[PDB]
Amino acid sequence: MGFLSGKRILVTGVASKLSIAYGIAQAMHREGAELAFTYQNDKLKGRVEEFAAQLGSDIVLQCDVAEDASIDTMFAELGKVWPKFDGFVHSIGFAPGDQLDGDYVNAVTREGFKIAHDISSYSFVAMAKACRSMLNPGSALLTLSYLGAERAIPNYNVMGLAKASLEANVRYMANAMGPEGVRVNAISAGPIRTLAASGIKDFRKMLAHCEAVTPIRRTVTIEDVGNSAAFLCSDLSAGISGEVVHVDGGFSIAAMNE
Amino acid sequence: GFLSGKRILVTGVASKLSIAYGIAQAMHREGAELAFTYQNDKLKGRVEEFAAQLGSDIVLQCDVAEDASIDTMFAELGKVWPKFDGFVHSIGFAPGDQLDGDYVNAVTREGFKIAHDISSYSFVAMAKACRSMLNPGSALLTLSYLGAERAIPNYNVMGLAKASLEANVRYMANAMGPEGVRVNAISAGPITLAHCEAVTPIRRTVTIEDVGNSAAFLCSDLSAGISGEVVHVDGGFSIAAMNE
Ligand SMILES: NC(=O)c1ccc[n+]([C@@H]2O[C@H](COP(=O)([O-])OP(=O)(O)OC[C@H]3O[C@@H](n4cnc5c(N)ncnc54)[C@H](O)[C@@H]3O)[C@@H](O)[C@H]2O)c1
Ligand SMILES: NC(=O)c1ccc[n+]([C@@H]2O[C@H](COP(=O)([O-])OP(=O)(O)OC[C@H]3O[C@@H](n4cnc5c(N)ncnc54)[C@H](O)[C@@H]3O)[C@@H](O)[C@H]2O)c1
Ligand SMILES: Cc1c(C2CN(C(=O)/C=C/c3cnc4[nH]c(=O)ccc4c3)C2)oc2ccccc12
Ligand SMILES: Cc1c(C2CN(C(=O)/C=C/c3cnc4[nH]c(=O)ccc4c3)C2)oc2ccccc12
Incomplete structure (x- = not known):
């Protein structure tokens, strides 16, 4: 048996095969995790349904986290199978x-x-409220963040006026939820390129430097991320709540080179 | 007067207890030329009254909720400080x-939305509205709390906005630096408004004068080498742990 044997985990934001959350899933299922999947709108249904096919999970449900009701009804349908998860x-x-x-x-x-803080930051706690009662003791939450939240990076602009907002969101959550047996963490992924560079300019060159400057001299992969995520979502990390773990290969810890 | 020859707009005065009041008090103390904002017909009275005390009387209606109010105040101010x-x-x-x-x-x-909107977005928004009136070696400032950095019970969504705000500060500095503008936050300790003293290194809370003289400094050219920085004027409470 792999760890997170015995566990039920819902995974949001699975746009593609190179979608990072595809990695988080992989690592988890690869470790015998029963998953569940949300898609945003009918456009992504497809499609993600198929990815869940691959990962051995039936559960496939719409959830547009802009709307409190959509998150509500999502979970409500999910309760039909996962009274708890x-x-x-x-x-x-x-x-x-x-x-x-x-x-x-x-x-x-x-x-x-407004939108950036609503969708990239609030939504996370929105989900937590709606399914708070459905969390077993010893369940964990995870969210994904970037170095923007910590530092000023051009053309990231408002994104981490959000990721910072989201970074604290982790903490207060982890704080409010521990008593009842819940851990809230977050992974600061390096880049890592998925459907997100669909608004990021200057990208082709962006990766090489910072590859020559990352302590490990390569960018982290959806596997590398999937892998820390699965650990951060498994009971192996039982003593980690409220921590922003960086998976950037150590990028954020160097400076002035070269 | 190490702040002399400078024109700074102070917002958010509402009482003797206000942080902004000590900031202004401290700022005039160093020969700064000051301007103020009110946000209510309520507040207009007191703000105007403190204006006279501090020798200035540029006093304008501004509510940071409305992008429109904002630009009108700046417009009205440009009439008297075309640049500041x-x-x-x-x-x-x-x-x-x-x-x-x-x-x-x-x-x-x-x-x-509301927390983030007023506590964090407002700060950049104003900055857009007066980009044009900012003289080289300008300084923007904002007042933050430790709830950004750590989860304080009952601070709740404010923590997240300040987090977002401090983020905002780092960006604003980076965007505005090539034009001689510095941006910083004071992460002030406890003291309008809304027993650390035993655990605080200096064995007392910071006071409006404490915060006052730091703002003053941060907005003067004496703090020339500081930008995008969150200075903890909390008496070292930030950096200590478990003091019995
Ligand atoms: N280098 C990187 O790409 C990188 C680095 C650090 C953090 N992250 C973060 O990781 C996460 C995934 O991004 P990614 O680029 O790896 O994959 P991605 O860009 O494919 O993920 C985007 C997801 O946004 C979701 N989405 C947008 N609006 C929505 C709405 N209203 N309702 C429901 N879903 C909505 C979609 O479901 C979609 O799957 C994001 O939170 C991103 O900020 C990415
Ligand atoms: N004294 C403290 O408790 C403390 C400690 C650390 C940080 N801070 C921060 O310092 C700042 C000021 O708070 P304070 O303690 O000086 O007194 P305060 O919070 O009463 O003053 C805030 C001012 O905000 C103004 N205001 C409210 N809504 C507005 C809007 N929509 N548009 C324009 N103006 C508006 C009011 O005129 C008010 O006087 C806040 O940002 C607060 O987070 C305060
Ligand atoms: C790497 C890297 C990233 C990562 C972090 N990920 C994101 O946060 C993406 C956010 C985002 C936010 N909004 C978006 N809106 C769109 O319409 C199309 C795509 C889109 C992407 C991509 O952002 C950078 C900004 C500047 C430089 C490098 C990076
Ligand atoms: C409070 C408060 C604020 C802002 C002003 N900010 C503050 O000064 C916060 C001070 C604060 C916040 N949280 C604290 N937590 C503690 O445990 C003990 C000290 C402590 C002090 C938060 O805006 C409001 C709008 C409507 C109603 C209340 C508030």
Whole structure:
């Protein structure tokens, strides 16, 4: 048996085969995890349904985290099979295309601010509220974050005015939920390129440097991420709640090279 | 007067107890030329009254909720300070509702939006609206708390906005640096507003004067080498643990 044997985990944000959350799933299922899957809208149903086919899970349900009701009804349907389950993965994030443009001050708008903080940050706790009662004792939550949340990176702009908002969200959550036997963590992924660079400019060159400058001299993979995520979602990490773990190959710990 | 020859806009004065009041008090003390904002017909009275005390009387109606109010105040200010050297962001809100008991239970969609909207977005928003009036060696400032960095019971969604705000500060500095603008936050300790003393290194809380003279400094050219920085004016409470 692999660990997270015995566990039921819901995994959000699975757009593709190179979708990171595809990695989180892989690692988990590879370790005998029974999963469940949400898709955003009818456009992604497909499709993700098939990926869940691959990973041996029936459960396939719409969930547009913009709407409290959609999250409610999602979980309600999920309860039909999983009266209880053991945590979910939050690999959701968005900010209107225009938002991640050039100069931050220029580009950022109240609405772009609103959406980015709603979808990449609030949504995570939104889900936690709706399924709080459905969490077994010893279940864990995870969400995915970036170094933007910690530092100013061009054309990331409002994204971590969000990821920072989301980074604290982790903490307060982990704080409110421990008493009842729940751990909230987050992985600071390096890059790692998936459907997200669909608003990120300058990307082709962006990876090489920072590959020559990462302590390990390669970018981390959806496997590398999937792998720390599965551990952070398994009982092996029983003593880790409220921590923002970096999986960037050590990128954020170097400086001035070369 | 190490702040002399400078024109700074202070927001968020509402009482003698206000942080912004000590900031202004401290700022005039160092010969700064000051301007103020009110947010209510309520507040207009007191703010105007303190204006006279501090020798200035640029006093304008500004509610950071409305992108429109914002630009009109800046427009009105440009008439008297066509250009100036920065502003203090002593604002924060959560319709709370929110800062009572369990975090997850308390928090709501709207509540998350409103906190973030006023406590964090406002700060950049103003910055857009006066980009153009900012003289080189300008300084923006905002008042934060430790709840950004650590989960304080009952601070709840505010923590997340300050987190977002401090993020915001780092970005703003980075965007505005090529034009001589510095941005910083004071992570102030406990003291309008809304027993660390035993655990605090200096064995007392910071005071409006403490925070005052730091703002002053951060907004003067004496703090020339500091930008995008969250200075903990909390008496070293940030950095200690388990003091019996
Ligand atoms: N290098 C990277 O790509 C990188 C690095 C660090 C963190 N992250 C984070 O990891 C997560 C996954 O992004 P990714 O780029 O790896 O894969 P991705 O870009 O395919 O993930 C995007 C997901 O956003 C979701 N989404 C957007 N709006 C939604 C809504 N209203 N309702 C429901 N779902 C919605 C979709 O379900 C989609 O699967 C994001 O939170 C992202 O910020 C990515
Ligand atoms: N004293 C403390 O408890 C403490 C400690 C650390 C940090 N802070 C921070 O300092 C800042 C100021 O708080 P304070 O303690 O000085 O008193 P306060 O919170 O009463 O003053 C805040 C001011 O915000 C203004 N305001 C509210 N909504 C507004 C809007 N929509 N548009 C424009 N202005 C608006 C009001 O005029 C008010 O005087 C806040 O950002 C707070 O988070 C306060
Ligand atoms: C790597 C890397 C990233 C990672 C982190 N991931 C994201 O947060 C993506 C966010 C995002 C946010 N909003 C978006 N909106 C869109 O319309 C299309 C794609 C889109 C992506 C991609 O962001 C960077 C910004 C600057 C430089 C490098 C990176
Ligand atoms: C409080 C509060 C705020 C802002 C002002 N900020 C603060 O000054 C916060 C101070 C604070 C916040 N949390 C704290 N937590 C503690 O446990 C003990 C000290 C402590 C102090 C939060 O905006 C509001 C809007 C409506 C209603 C209440 C508030």
